[PDB]
Amino acid sequence: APRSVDWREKGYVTPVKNQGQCGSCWAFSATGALEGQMFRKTGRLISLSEQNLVDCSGPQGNEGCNGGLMDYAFQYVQDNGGLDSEESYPYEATEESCKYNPKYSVANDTGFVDIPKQEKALMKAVATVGPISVAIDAGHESFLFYKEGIYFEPDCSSEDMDHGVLVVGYGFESTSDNNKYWLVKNSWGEEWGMGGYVKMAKDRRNHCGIASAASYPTV
Ligand SMILES: *[C@@H](C(=O)OCC)[C@H](O)C(=O)N[C@@H](CC(C)C)C(=O)NCCC(C)C
């Protein structure tokens, strides 16, 4: 695997979005990964509807603004046979009745792959697949008010993950102990962190659980 990967450099990643006051992180992490795989497949980068997932993927186990899972979202897209564009079904930060329209479907997937729960397995996936949906422990004020640099929270849990985000690459901080990081796309707007991104400690014992719930859709 390469020592450094950053899929934003190759056009795989839409601009940072903002979930607002809705527990819909799972939907944004899911659209992020599917946007990456659809771009690899077609060469077209098209923003996808988190609202479609919020309103319609209840049968697969998601709960709208009361949470969900990226794998459930990938299953909905497979079950449903498509997912609408962001443009045609824009984000509302509240759940309403399902309004999926196949006429505006711009994506599909055939399932998903759950990655083994090891950071080096996550590294290979990021290097060979593209952006990867992951779960992290985001429940600390150090993370809420994160500004820049490599985030490391000694109290972070590797099993109490609560926030779905997107790993778009990894790297190392030039000038050899605790220098590696994951490049993570968050869904809290472009003002949060580093243009919406956070560098999360890598190879420091699965910090904040980043490798415990990693997955991507198959297209
Ligand atoms: C994520 C979120 O929006 O928090 C940022 C404020 C949601 O809380 C959420 O869906 N969390 C989720 C696990 C993530 C995807 C790692 C969860 O708790 N799922 C179980 C709840 C059930 C509705 C599936």
Q: With left for phi above 0 and alpha for psi between -120 and 50, is residue 208 left, alpha or beta?
A: left
> Is 207 one of the annotated active-site residues of the chain?
no
Domain boundaries, the chain: 1-219
Give the N- to C-terminal CA distance of the chain in Å, as an integer: 23
- Say yes or no: CB of residue 69 within 6 Å of ligand 1: yes
Structure tokens belonging to residue 3:
């020592």
> Is 163 one of the annotated active-site residues of the chain?
yes
Dihedral angle over CA of 31, 36, 40, 42, nearest 10: 40
Dihedral angle over CA of 36, 91, 81, 76, nearest 10: 90
> Is 25 one of the annotated active-site residues of the chain?
yes
Residue 147 neighbours by CB distance under 10 Å: 9
Residue 79 is assigned to a ligand binding site: no
**For strand 163-172 and strand 5-6, is the pairing parallel, antiparallel, or unpaired?**
antiparallel
What type of residue is 126?
Answer: V
- Say yes or no: CB of residue 132 within 6 Å of ligand 1: no
Query: 71: Cβ–Cβ under 8 A, 6 or more apart, which residues?
Result: 112, 114, 215
Q: How far does residue 128's CA lie from ligand 1's centre (Å)?
A: 27
Geometric angle at alpha carbon 78, from 93 and 44, rounded to 5°: 75
Contact 211, 115 (CB under 8 A): yes
Domain at 1-219: CATH code: 3.90.70.10
Across the strands, what pairs with 135?
164
Interatomic CA distance for residues 36 and 202, integer angstroms: 22
Structure tokens belonging to residue 182:
């994951």
Q: Which helix (H) or strand (E) holds 74?
A: helix 70-80
Interatomic CA distance for residues 14 and 159, integer angstroms: 29
Contact 36, 131 (CB under 8 A): yes
Geometric angle at alpha carbon 168, from 166 and 170, rounded to 5°: 120
Across the strands, what pairs with 113?
216
